[PDB]
Every structure is written in C-alpha cells, then in structure tokens.
Amino acid sequence: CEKGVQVLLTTIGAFAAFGLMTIAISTDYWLYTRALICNGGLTHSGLWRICCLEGLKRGVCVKINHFPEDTDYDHDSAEYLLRVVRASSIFPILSAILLLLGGVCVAASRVYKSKRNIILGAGILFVAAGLSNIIGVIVYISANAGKNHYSYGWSFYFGGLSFILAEVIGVLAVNIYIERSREAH
Amino acid sequence: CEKGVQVLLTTIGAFAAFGLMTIAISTDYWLYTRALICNGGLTHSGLWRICCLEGLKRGVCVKINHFPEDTDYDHDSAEYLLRVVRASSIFPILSAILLLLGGVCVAASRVYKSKRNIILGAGILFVAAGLSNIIGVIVYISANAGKNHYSYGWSFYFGGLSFILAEVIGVLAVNIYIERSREAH
Amino acid sequence: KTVVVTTILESPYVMMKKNHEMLEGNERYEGYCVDLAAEIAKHCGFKYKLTIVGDGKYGARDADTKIWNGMVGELVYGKADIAIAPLTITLVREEVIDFSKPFMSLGISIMIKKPQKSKPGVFSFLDPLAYEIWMCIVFAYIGVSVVLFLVSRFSPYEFGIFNSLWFSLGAFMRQGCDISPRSLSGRIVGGVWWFFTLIIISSYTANLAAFLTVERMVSPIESAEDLSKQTEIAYGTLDSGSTKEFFRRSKIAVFDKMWTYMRSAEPSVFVRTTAEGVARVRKSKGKYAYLLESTMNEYIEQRKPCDTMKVGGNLDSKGYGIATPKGSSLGTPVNLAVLKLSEQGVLDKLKNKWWYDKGECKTSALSLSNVAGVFYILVGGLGLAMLVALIEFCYKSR
Amino acid sequence: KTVVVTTILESPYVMMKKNHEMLEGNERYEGYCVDLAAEIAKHCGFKYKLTIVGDGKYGARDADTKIWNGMVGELVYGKADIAIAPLTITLVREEVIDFSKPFMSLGISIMIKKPQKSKPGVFSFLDPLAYEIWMCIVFAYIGVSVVLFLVSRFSPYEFGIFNSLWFSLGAFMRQGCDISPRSLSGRIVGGVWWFFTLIIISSYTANLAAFLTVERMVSPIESAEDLSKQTEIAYGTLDSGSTKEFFRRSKIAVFDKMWTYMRSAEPSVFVRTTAEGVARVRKSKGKYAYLLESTMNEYIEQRKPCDTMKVGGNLDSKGYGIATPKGSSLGTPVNLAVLKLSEQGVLDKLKNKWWYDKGECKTSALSLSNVAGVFYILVGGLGLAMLVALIEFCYKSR
Amino acid sequence: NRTYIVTTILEDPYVMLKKNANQFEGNDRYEGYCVELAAEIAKHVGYSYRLEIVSDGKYGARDPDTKAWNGMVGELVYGRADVAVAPLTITLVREEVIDFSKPFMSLGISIMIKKPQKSKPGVFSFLDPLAYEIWMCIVFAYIGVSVVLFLVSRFNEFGIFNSLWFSLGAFMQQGCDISPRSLSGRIVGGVWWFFTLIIISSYTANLAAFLTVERMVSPIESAEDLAKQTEIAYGTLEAGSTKEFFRRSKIAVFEKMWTYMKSAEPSVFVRTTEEGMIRVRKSKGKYAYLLESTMNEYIEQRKPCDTMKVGGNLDSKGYGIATPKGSALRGPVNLAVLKLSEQGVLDKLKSKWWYDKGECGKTSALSLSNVAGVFYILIGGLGLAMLVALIEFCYKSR
Amino acid sequence: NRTYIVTTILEDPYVMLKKNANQFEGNDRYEGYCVELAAEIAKHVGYSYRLEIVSDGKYGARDPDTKAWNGMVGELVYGRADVAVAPLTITLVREEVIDFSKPFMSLGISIMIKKPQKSKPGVFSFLDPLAYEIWMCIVFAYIGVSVVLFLVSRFNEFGIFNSLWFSLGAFMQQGCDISPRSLSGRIVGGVWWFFTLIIISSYTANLAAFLTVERMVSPIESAEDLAKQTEIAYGTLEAGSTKEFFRRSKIAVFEKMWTYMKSAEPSVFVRTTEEGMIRVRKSKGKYAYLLESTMNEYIEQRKPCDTMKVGGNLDSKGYGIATPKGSALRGPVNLAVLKLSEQGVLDKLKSKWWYDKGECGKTSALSLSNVAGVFYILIGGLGLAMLVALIEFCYKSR
Ligand SMILES: CCCCCC/C=C\CCCCCCCC(=O)O
Ligand SMILES: CCCCCC/C=C\CCCCCCCC(=O)O
Ligand SMILES: N[C@@H](CCC(=O)O)C(=O)O
Ligand SMILES: N[C@@H](CCC(=O)O)C(=O)O
Ligand SMILES: N[C@@H](CCC(=O)O)C(=O)O
Ligand SMILES: N[C@@H](CCC(=O)O)C(=O)O
C-alpha cells in the first residue's frame, strides 16, 4: 500500500535474498549429474564441492578441481579465464556482498532520513547484484558444459529466487526514492 | 503548378498511356526467345502472334496456339483458366478500355464542370487499369513459363510505362477532385 | 544331342546384338535369358540352338480349337525341346508341360505415360502448414481479438472489436500497429499472441522454401480401382499372354469388371506385342494404360526416353519359369540349375546388370509462376477495398 | 631351397594372429607384407621362412663401428636371404644392397595428440560475416546517420546526430524507432538503409545456425616450421630409422635446426620402437610430436582410440621397397613381381583392406556455452548504462 | 481313404496354438496361416489331413557326419510324416531328396534390430532449438533489462510496467509504443535489440535445422556394415536354411559373416526364432538377428512392436510345401497352390495374418501436434488475462 | 670421354623449346624440368650429355606383330640413344627389355575435363533468390498498393507521399509511422502485409538455400560413371603406357573402358597429349581425356586454365630414367636420383615448373564481394538524397 510498509518489505526481501544466496554459495546440491568419482555413479554437486551419493562412498564430500581438471591444453586460451571465474565464484559472492550492502543502506536510510541518495544506492546495489548473479549462473553452466542427464537442485533455484528478489527490491527502493524526491519536491 | 495545367497533363498522359497499351496489345515484340518454329531458331514473340526472325522463314508472322499446345492433360485443372486468360488477353484490353474511359471522363469533366464525381470516376478507372495491366503481365509470364534465355521487348516496357502513367494519372485526378471539393467546401 | 531352345524377342530378356547381321548362331541374340540358358546348358551338360518362336507369342490355348500357340505350343507339339524366356507360370500351362522353380518374380502392373511435373499450385503458400492448423490459427486469432475486446471493456485503464482485430492481425504479420494495450491483462494477451506469432511464423518461414517450388507427379490412376471406375483412359494387355487369361478367369469384382470392359471396347485395347503397347502408351497421351508384367515396366521406366511410369502395386504376384515338355528328362536338371544359381547369387547380379546398369535416368531461384497466386490476392483485396470505399461513399452521399 | 625372409613386427605391416601360440610357422604372422611375400614367393618360385629381425630394428650403420644393424645387417651379413618390410629406400642402403621398385609410397610426417574440438569461441556471432564487412557495415552506419543529419539540417520540412544514429541503429535491428523522416531525401536515405538491413540480416541469419555450433580442431603445429620455432612441444623419431638419417644428413635450414634440437634435447626425444612413440604422444598431452612415415600415421589415425592425428604435409616423399643382398639373383624376379602386382591392382586392394577396412572412426540444440558471449555483452552494456547515468547525475548534482 | 500326416512347426503366425487349446483337440488345436492353407489344399485334393508338430521344433537340416535328416525333412524323408505344410525354405540340398511344390510366399534373408529411441517430437517441440537454460537466462535478462531501464530512465514513460513491455516487444519484434530518449535508455535498448537479434536468428535458423532434418539414421542399415561391426552380435537359427546359406555362401560379406558366426562366443545362434527375438529385445542393441523377412515384418507388427527390419533383403527365395521323393501327391498339391494364387487367396490370408491384426498400426506439412503446445500456452494466457481483469475490476470498483 | 646421347620428348613442362630457340643451338635449345634434371645427373656422374628429341614424338610401345620398339624405348633398345630422361612410365613390359631407375616423380591415371560454367556469384547475388520478374512486379505492386491506399483514404495522413512510405516500411518490416483507421485502408494494409510476409519469407529461405548450397556437382566424378557414359568420348595416347594399362587391364571398369576405346568411331585416341588437350578444349564437354596426373595439373594451371582434373587417380606409378639393358651407367644414375630426392631438389624443380608460374592462381564467412552490390546501392542512394536535398533547398529558398 506504500505507506512505509514498502521499506519493511524491502529490507526483509533483501535479507531473505542474501540468505538464499549465501545458502546457495554454501551448499552443494546445485546439480544431480553422474560422475566418475563414486566407484559412473550418481552425484549431487555444487559450486564448491562435489559430494557423492547412491554410491560406494555415499557421503564423501570432495572438493572439486576447477582449473586442474587435466588441463592438457588451452592455458591462456580464454577458457582459463572462465575456469578461474567459476572456481573463484566471485560473481555469486559479489551478489551476496551487494545484497548485504543494500540492506545496510536500506537500514541506514531508516536512520539518516535526511539523505535520499542512500536508498537509490541501495537499489543500484540490488540491481548489480542481480546482474552478477545471472553471470554467475552463466559461467557455472558454460563451465559445467566441460552427454548425460543432469538437473538443478534447490540451491540453483535459490539463486534464481535471489535474483528475482534482488530485482524486485531494486524496483521498490527506486520507488521509495521517487516518493522521497516528490516529498522534497 | 496545379492551376489547370494538371488537367491537360492528365489527359495527355491518359491518351499516351492508352496509346502505349494499344501498341503493346497490337504488337509482337514482347519477347525474344528461341522456339521450334524457325527451321531451334530465334523468335521475337508477342501477345497475339509469334513472328520468326534470323531464321529460314525470316518474317513469317504466325498466330500462336495458346490453349491447343498439345494439351495432353490438365483440362479443367486451373491451368486451362490461365491459358484462356492469356489467350483472350482480356486484362490488357481491359486496361486499354479503362484508360480510354478515363480520358473520356476527364474530357467530359472539362465540359460538365458542375459534377465533381466524374473526375473521381476517371481516377478509379485509371487505377483499375493499372491493376489489370499488372495481372496481364503476371498471366503472360506465368503462362510463357509453359530453360533457355529470354528477354522482354519494347512492347513489354510500353505496357509497363502504361501502368506507371495510369497510376500517376489516378493520383493527379484524385488531387483534382480534392481541390474541386475544397473549392466547393 | 543339341537342344532346340525356344524363346522370344522381348527386351531386356532377349535382344539381338548390334550388328547382328554380321553374326550367325547363338551369338546373334544377347540378353538376360541368353546368359541363363548358356549357364543351364553348362550345368545340365548338353548343347542348345536358340530359336525365336515363329508366332512371336508367349503361349495360350484356343477356346474353340484347343490348340497351344507360341512357345507352349512348340513344347507340347514337339517343335521345341525347352523354353527359357520371360514365361509366366500358371495352372493351365502346368496341365500340359512342366515348369521349373521361378528364377525371378513379378507382378501384373500398370504402365502410364509420365504425367508432367505439376508445378506447385496457386495457394501453395498454405502447404507448409496443415489445414487444421490454419483453421485453428483463425479460431485463435478471433479468440484473441474477442478476449482483448472483453478485457478492454470490462477492465479499462480504445480497443473496439475492429481495432482489436487490427492489432492482432498486425501482430501476426510482425508489423506493429500504432495502438498498443495499456492495461495488465491486455498486455498479457498481447504478449502471448506475440509469442504465438513468433513460433508460427518461424516454423512456416523455415519450411517455406521448398513448398513453393516443390514439383509433384500426381497420376489420374493409382490402382486398378481408378481404372475400373473410368473409361476416359483405356487399359489393355498383350495378346495370348497370361495376363489376359488371368483377367478372363478372375472371379474378383475389379478384375472381372475390367475384363468385361476390355472384351468389348472399341477400338481394341489389346495388342500383338509389348513394344506396340509401349508405343500406344507413349503416344496415346495418357488415354491408354498398359497392363504388363512388372519387370518390363521397370526396365522401360529406367530406359530412355524414361517417358513411362509404373503405377499401383502389383495386382498379383507371380514368377517367370523355365519350361519343358511334360515327361521330359530335362525337368529335374534345369530345376537344380535354377536353385544352384539363385543360391550362389548369379540371378541377382544379372537382374542388376541388365536393369540398373542400363540406367539412363537443386536450389533454384523462384519463378513468378511459383508466387503468382499471392499477387492475385493482393490485387483482389485492392479491388475489394476500392469497391468497399465506393459503397461507403455511395451510402454517405445518400 | 627355402628363403630366409627377414621382416619386422610393425603393424599393420606385420602382426601375429590372435591365438598365435596355437600356431606355428609362417601362419603365426599376418599382415600386408605377409600377403605380399606369399605372393612374391608364388611368382618367383621358391620357398620362404618368415623371421622377425632379432634386433627389432629396420636398419642403420654405426658411425664408429660401421656395422649394419637390423634387417639391412642381416642381408649384408648373410643372416637373411631377403627383406619384405616397411623398409624405406635411401642412398646409403643402395650402396650395400639392392632394392626393388617401391611397392608403395609415403612421406615423413608429424603425428600429434588429437586436440579437443575447440568449442566455438565467444564472439562467434561475427563468424557468419567477414571482418571487412563489419568494418564496412560500421562505416556505412556512420555514413548514413551523418547524411541524414546533414539532409535534415540543410533541407528540413528533429534529427540531431544522436537521434539519427538511433534511428539508423533501430532500423538495423528491425525495431522501428518512434521517430521517422518526413522529407523526401531523408525518406530515401531511410529506404536504402532499410534495404541494406534486409539483405544483410537475411544473409547473416541464413548462415548463423552452424557458426555458433561449429566445432573446429586447430592444432598448435601446422608444419615443420611451427616445430622448429618452439620447444614447448618436442619432436622425436624412431631410432636406426631412415627418418633419423635423413634429418641428420639434411642440408636444409628447418631440418638441420630440428636435428640440432633433437640431438641434444633431454630427456631423449628418440625412441626404440614405433608403438613406444605412439604411447609417448598418446600420454605426453601434446608436449610431444612424433616424426614417422605417413602410412603408420594414417592407420593409427583410423584405428581406435583414434586419439592421434597427422598434421602437416609430408616433408619428403619416399617409398617402401623390398630388398635383397647385393649381387643376389633374387633382385631381378622380385622386381618384376612388384611391377606385375601394381599393374594388376593387388597392392591398392591390400592398401585399402588393411587400412580402410580397419576403419573404426547432426542438428543439435544450442547450448548456453554457444551463445553465452552475447549475454555478457548484454550485462556489460547494462553496467555501462548504469554507470553512465550516475555520471550524468553526479554531473548534474554538481 | 486314410487321413494324411501333416508335419509342421510352431512359428507364429504360420501355425500357433489356439487360445484355450487345452479345451480343444485334434486339428482344431492350432491356428495359423498354414493351418487354413492346408485346409484348402486338402479340400482341393479331396483327402483328410491330421496335424502334427515336429518333435524338435526345428525345421530341417543335415548332420554332416551321420548324414541324417532332422525336423520336418527328417520326418518326411524317413516316412514319419506324409506332408509338410510350413515355412520350409526351398534350397538345392533339400530339393535333392524330397519333392517341393511351387511356392506360396516369397521372402529373403534380412536383419532384425531392437528399436532405438524414438525421440519423437512432442507438443513442446518449439523450445528444443534453445535449451532450457537459455530460456531461463532469457527470462532473467528480460527482468534485468527492464529493471535497469526503469532505473536509468527514472532518476519519460518508462516505469517498470512499460519497461517490461518495451523489452517484451523488442524481443518479439512486434514494435515499441515508446522509444528511449536518454543516452542510458538508448544504450540498454540498443543492447537488448542486439541480444534479441542474435537469439532470434539463432532460434529460427536452428528451427529450420530441426524441421528440415528429422531422424534419418541407422548404423548397420546394410550387410557390409553388419559384417564390419564387432560390438554387435548376429547369427542365425540352427536347423534351417539361413544357417546353410551363410555357411555355403561363396560371397565376400556372407563368407565373413559366416566366419564371425562360426566362432563367436557365446553361440550367436539360437534354437528357436523366438529365442533370437527375445535375445534382441533383451540385447540392448547388442544382438542383430538374421532371419527371414516375413517373420521380421510380423514381429515388428505385433506388440511389443519393439523391433524393426533393416536393410534390403540379402537374397530372395520362397516357402513351399514338401513331400517325400517320388510320392504321387505332389501334382495335385502344385495345382492347388497355383489355383490359390490366381484366386486371390494367399494374398487374403497374408493380409489376415500380418496386417489385419495390427497390434501397432522430402518436406511434409506440419502436424498440429508438433506445435500445439503453443495453443495450450495461448489459451492459458487468455484465461489468465480474463482472471486478472476480474481482479482489476474488483480492485477498482471498491 | 664422349658426350652421351639423351633421347626425350616434347611435353611441356618436362621438356620444351625455349622462346627464341631459333636463336639458340645445342643443349640450350630446350628448357624443362627434365632438362635441369639431366643437367644435375650428368653433373653428378661427371659426363657430358647431348640432347635429342625422339623422331616420332611418341613415347614408346611395341608393335604386336613386328614386335618392334618405337619412340624413346625404340631409340634406346636398338642403340640410337644412350639415355632417356623423360616421363617414361615404368611398367612390366618395358622393364623386361631395358634398365629403369628409381623414380623421380609419382603419378597415376586420371581424368581431364573441360571446365563447365563457373556460375560464379557476382556482386548482385542478393537478388538471385527472386527472379527479375518478381522484383519488377513487386515494384509494380508497391506502386499499386500505395496509389490505392491514397485513394481510398482520401475520398487521414495518407497522401501519396506518406502512402509510398507506409508501403515501403511494411515491406522491409521496419515499422509504420502511421496505421490506417479506415476499413479500406486496413484491408489494403492487411493485404500488403501478407504479400510482404510471403515474399520476404520466400526470399530469406531461398537465400539460405543458396548460401548453404554452392556448386558441388560434377557428372562423371569417378571411373565407373565414365565407363557408363555414352554421350562422352574418352581415350588415351597412342604409343604410351596408359593405352597399355587400359588394354591389359583385368578389371571390370577398365576392361569396359578398353572395349569402348577400342571401338569408338572416330578414334578416341590421339597422337599427342596436346591433341587430346585441344580436343577436350574444343569438345564442348564431349571428350574426356584419360592421361597422367602431372600433366593434368600443369595444364589446369596454365592459361587458358579451362580444364580440370576430376576423380581420384585410377592407379599409381612413377616416371623414371631409362637405359639399355645391361648398361654400366644405371648404378650412378640411380644413386644420383636418390641424392636429388633426399636433398630437396625434385621438390624444388616441381614447384618451379608447376606452381611457380601459376598462369591462373562446410560453412564459410561471406566475402564482401558476395554482398557488395548492396553498398553500391546504398552509396548511390546517399548521393541521390543529398542531390534531392539540394534541389529542395533551391526550390524552397526561391
Ligand atoms: C555497449 C557494448 C558493451 C560491450 C561490453 C562487452 C564487455 C565485456 C564482455 C566480454 C568479456 C568476455 C571475455 C572472454 C573472452 C576473452 O578472453 O576475450
Ligand atoms: C482480402 C482477401 C482477398 C481474396 C481475393 C482472392 C480472389 C481471387 C484470387 C484467386 C484467383 C485464382 C484462381 C485460379 C485457381 C483456381 O482455379 O481456383
Ligand atoms: N510371361 C507372360 C507375359 C504376359 C504379359 O506380358 O502380360 C506370359 O507368358 O503370359
Ligand atoms: N621404413 C623406415 C621407417 C622409419 C620410420 O618409421 O621413421 C626405415 O627403414 O627407416
Ligand atoms: N525357413 C527356414 C528356417 C528359418 C531359418 O533358417 O532362418 C528353412 O526352412 O530353412
Ligand atoms: N608417360 C606415358 C605416356 C603417356 C600416356 O601413355 O598416357 C608412358 O611412358 O607410357
């Protein structure tokens, strides 16, 4: 109804999105492919660590090799840059950082209400967060490409819902800034 | 400049177009194909009659067989209707008729200036003339199709210029009618 | 010691060699059956003198005089020792002579003059989509316009029915109409309509290339049924041939009806020799239709001018069989020769060489003939429009 | 009376049959050269006992002891009557024994580990058009916007430069910008620009399907030059093989440089047997590169795992030749056998059967990896835009 | 006046045990093509016939050592049975010792395979050209572009509600009620447009790639290939003429296939056609059965309907009744067979037993099924829009 | 210390008469590959050589009756010449009577054809998908639609000047500043749109059809076909080993081609390779010459450059120096040949004589040439627009 409820909705959405994105980063059920780890065998996989299942090991959560996957060619071939970014996962964590900073700026907006540009900065943060997260998805997929079945687990759609919420919040924050400016008029 | 010169331009264009179209109908240099008439040999051809050249006969202007070209199949197959229309050449002659009637209505407009719809009827006549002529071209080509070199002679482009002029005249006549209505206001 | 071979001059089963006048003996004739008979005398172990049946006939029994003509007559009447020909196997010829296991198979089939490649028809631009899709497309276009009209009336922020129809139509043809929706439901309807068009048009344009240039041979006959159901086009046979007898003795509706037709038609449908019937088809301009054994039809289709075509599946299945006089001691060996050859694979090789080795038979710019139809439509609508306006005007002036 | 045949165990020229332990005699070995030698003894008219050279070597002369190793040694040193092998012809081996006319041809060639199918690169969506066309396209887009600006200024009925650029850009991407020209010259310019786009886009989209999915093997080596110009990747040879001697004696720049490289590289590039070098390539992960005769490279490429590839045209052309001791009376007949066989066509048939008959080696949905690049661009521009606005805003607030 | 013994074999549909056969006795225990056939034959010759299955369930063949006759031929030659009415392929060896009859059905040696994945195009086949991931990330980019454009525009009619529109029109190429006037809005529009162009061109080109390319692939698809493959198993039936043909073949491919079959472990052969059928069904593409063509077709027709014939028939031969050598029954049987043929019977029975059951029943116009998911989507959007308009009507009225 | 006689033949580029040879005498009269080659050979063996052409201008062959030797082999065997340095193909018969040497160049029997129409895509190749007639009638329809729309609209912003615009945007799919509000205007718009869609879809699909399909056709393209064709002539050179190979071939295709060549009137043979060359050049696709591959390539390279090699080489053999049987010169010559090979010489000369001259020097990205006519058009329209704006500026200023 946009009589101050907008801000509380904004902040809870921001922190929920940050939570989803932190979970997704900090979780290993991004994938449900079959790999040659299980002694070939079913594997739910993640951004950081594989961890087998329905296999002999059945619970051995291994750390993955992103760049050192038998490189065998193509160092400094523009594939290395992708593999770096996937492994580092700088874009998802950037999204998380930006969501956090957006919630920070939102809360500080509730405090230093004299300044209006703060909420606008928050909106920009959320938006850039969304863009970064979609890039995170893109790199993840365009690396995972290197033809068996595969699937995406609740962590992937948590990142997806994080992006959705981030964009929504960008909208709402910008709307707040606009109302604030009109009040300033 | 549109102070009465428009009408004289209209009528001379109309009668020039009618002349071109009558020539084209009444001429046999529509084509420059090679046919099995000359004893195979070069042939300039037309809407009505072939007439060989650069051949043994070299001047024998024969009448063509449009429907009776060894029919051998396809009576009442929707090819017969095309061959009828090509042979009859009803569409080109319709264009000529309409151009004539348009010039008639133009001249009568110079006489019974009390009525304005006359010039408008003239414009419609010219326009329909153009449409009919393009159909004439289309049927001509879509029959002539039934892979040697071929070419189109000055009579074809006379029909083309006739259509151009007919459309131009439709424009000018309509413009006249509009000025006449504004004067009536 | 030598064996009087009977046969016939029917290509590609028997043909005199080029410059045969410069030759005398069995070398005069070359053909599939010549090769076969040479092999057969090789296996059996005797000598053969080839002979073309004097009557130029296959075989048949007089219904009054009960005499056997042609090669069957020669064998029954001692004139001939054996026959190695495109001779067909039937009951009647069993009852008087002994045939061998079929050395190749066949059917009774229909030969026609190759109809011309029927240029793609006017209104070809519907081919890339089935006719139930266009009907569904139209129901859908109407439905959308209706639904956008209802929505803009009941829940507005103007889309009369005609303007809604216009917007939808413009969106199908990818041309953006000037008016756009402003609400959230009309915008949805427009979005889904847009997706609809994107898919439909993408598909249609994907396959539109071939369909407007595709050239398809459709024949006025597709079976014996389409023969017995008409008399514009005739259908005849060879004379004294098993095809004739099979039709005559047939107890089936179609074949009996066609037999009745052909036993009285004037001028006579029948002929005296195959090549004569081939010519009759090749000149009758599709008013005739020959009923011969399949193999001849195939070879003739492959051989130039390649101006004839087999149509309709074989009305029956039969087989060609070497023959012998009844009680001859040549029946048992010729049989085993056929079997040995078929097992080894000679007969397939001959069938390929005499037929396939005789074989003598792109992306192209569009011709106006292809896309002419749409032009007509164009002009049509224009005419219509003109007319319409006049109506309106005549109505208003009133 | 029997002839002591020398040869070697080098596939596909000589191979022991499966379950050879269950066999004794010349039947133990099967191979191209086995077939050849059988034929040769058939033609010449003697008997042969096959023998694999004990040293497992082809032939070469000690630079100090001046002894001949392997099959050449056996022939010169009486151990062997004849050699029928993938033995190469060279001057040095002429000077001590007599070779025959080459029974097949070859070259010295480069074997590499099959590099992976390099997925189409980012910015692949430019491939369907050459790079001079995009440059010309851009010059043209600028030119059009310029010309429409000049025209709208000098001869007006508003198209600033930026708005003109916008209209042109919108017309290239088929999205109708809201502003349109109103004069007769701007309308012309727009019309021609529109035709331009229609053609360009039609072509590009016509061929865009394959280019974004095309997968191309590009190798880090394409000739001897790219070998001698690097030391990341090694290049070695068989030992006591004519390849070694040819490199050693070479007076050309490239081959001498590579000879210098390989006479001192550590660990040793050379090997003791072909299959060892095959393995070295198949494991060295492309850091090695084998220099062997072409035929082996071909067979290995066709044979599974099919994980190796021939690269670069044959540095030289040579031929494999049956051999004999100098002054032997077996030289003249073996020669004529080779000639007769090559004339009849046996050698081609063997070459096809042992190589091609050993052969053991679609429209697919787009993967995001294919079209990922454009996404990045998208986001990039978005970022840029954001930034830009901030700039403007920061400038305005100042 | 004695009933005549009739040996035969259990191979669907030639002969089969009736449902409820335990409730039946005598010649009414079995049903099948050959059942009716023998019925008419004995009707013609005017004798009584007693049905009997062959003990071994194996057709017939000869022990090379004992030189004995098994199966139906063993039954006949040694006198256990008076007549054989079953698919008893005619061949040289069998005919030496018994009296066959003119065929009644024709066939050849053919390949049977397990059906691979149908990969049938569903109703949402219009998404296949672009992976699920691309559609997802397209939606993500739509949301991104729209939110960014709102933002840069609003710190203009570029709210979020109109931005999502503008960025939905641009993707579908159906226009733009509005065009950005800012540098930032224009940068974003000019990036979405490019993204759009690439994606749409890609989708359409690959769509054309799908529609003009449907499943037209099978690996073996011939006989040479089959003889070349090694990951697959293929063999024959013991005690039949298929094994005999392969074993006695003097052809290259057939000889090699005989070599393979005679040495593959486990025994590629089986004892019953049903055994090989169940093997291929449970072979996971690892068994390819070589048998006749009649049974191949029949098996393909009946459920599971999980098999298919492949390749053209290797040879061509025929079934046939059989009798002991020198018997006095052969003549009437042959005449009966020919009568049946001319009368349209054998065709009738074949249609009844093969196609009447029907357990499972270039460019071509699109079926509505291929693209019906679009209509489902469209309908869903229509209903949703009416729902949303109801919502808006309520929200506004209050 | 005598100069050694050197017979050879005049066949470019192996040996040729120098330009201004009338101004030259002795061994400096001729130039060609084999000229230099003999130079180095005599340099190596340290003797002096005197060049001589063969009287007959025919290589060598044997009369079957007189059993005599003609050409270079006749010169050598009977002692007229001491050495032959020319393309003297090695074969069994020749080698019996003279001493060949290890080859110096490799080749085979190959087909030469007259180049068919290039059909090269010009610069206005973007119109090809639609015939000249369609473009004309499209312009006609544009004029028709625009004039009609003006009319029905004006008895609205639909003057003629804006109508031609609207009907130009619609065709290019680049938008519409205006949309008709009348029933008549809407009918016409809705017809132009449809016409547009069909035409554009057609043009684009057929464009894809062109670009993804370039010239990839040649009729003969093999040896089997050549032996199957009859509208074409093909033969050999008299007094050479190509005729010998065809005549003595024990192969099917080669045997049939020998049959054809031995009986075709007029004599398909010629006396000089040049004669057959000029025949095929002046055969109008009616002569196809079977010769070596070296000359085929060289001829293709040099102007007219109106020929092409086709098909893979039928066989594979090599040239070679020759000497009288038993001579004492063969050894040094063979060693010299091998030295030349290892040293990179023969490669050098081949490159010099074949490719150095160079009289005429799936998907692939478009060349700017393919689509440059667009840029010509665009530039023309630009200049025209500036001109028209100048006109308008004058007309307005006055
Ligand atoms: C308005 C135009 C926006 C252009 C923005 C594009 C900027 C960056 C995207 C490209 C990054 C991909 C680089 C990986 C391949 C490489 O190594 O070059
Ligand atoms: C607004 C829609 C306009 C529809 C106007 C179409 C009317 C006539 C054009 C079709 C004439 C072509 C008929 C020839 C083929 C046939 O025999 O049916
Ligand atoms: N061989 C067949 C030929 C019949 C036909 O050609 O129709 C016969 O003897 O009757
Ligand atoms: N046949 C060659 C083999 C050398 C190689 O494989 O490199 C030789 O005798 O030297
Ligand atoms: N019908 C075959 C048996 C089946 C087979 O061998 O494949 C025969 O009579 O020999
Ligand atoms: N080089 C060939 C002559 C050319 C030919 O016969 O085609 C020879 O020595 O026999």
Author numbering:
A (entry chain J), B (entry chain I): 15 to 53, 79 to 185, 196 to 234
C (entry chain B), D (entry chain D): 393 to 549, 570 to 773, 783 to 819
E (entry chain A), F (entry chain C): 388 to 542, 565 to 770, 779 to 815
The authors write:
AMPA-type glutamate receptors (AMPARs) mediate rapid signal transmission at excitatory synapses in the brain. Glutamate binding to the LBD triggers clamshell closure, which transmits to the transmembrane domain (TMD) to open the channel’s gate, or leads to desensitization through rupture of one or both LBD dimers. TARPs are principal AMPAR auxiliary subunits, comprised of three groups; Type-1a (γ2, γ3) and Type-1b TARPs (γ4, γ8) are widely expressed, generally slowing gating kinetics, increasing agonist potency and reducing channel rectification by polyamines.
In resting and active states, the β1 loop adopted a ‘collapsed’ conformation, favouring engagement of the GluA1 and GluA2 D2 (lower) LBD lobes. β1 loop contacts with GluA1 D2 predominated in the active receptor, while interactions with both GluA1 and GluA2 D2 lobes, were evident in the resting state. This transition may enable TARP control of the critical M3 gating linker and increase stability of the open state through tension on the M3 gating helices. On the other hand, the vestibule above the gate adopts two-fold symmetry, and rearrangements in this region precede opening of the gate; the force transmitted from LBD cleft closure unzips three sets of contacts between the M3 helices of a GluA1/2 dimer: (1) between GluA1 Met625 and GluA2 Val626; (2) between GluA1 Arg624, GluA2 Arg628 and GluA1 Ser781; and (3) contacts between GluA1 Leu620 and Thr621 and GluA2 Ala622.
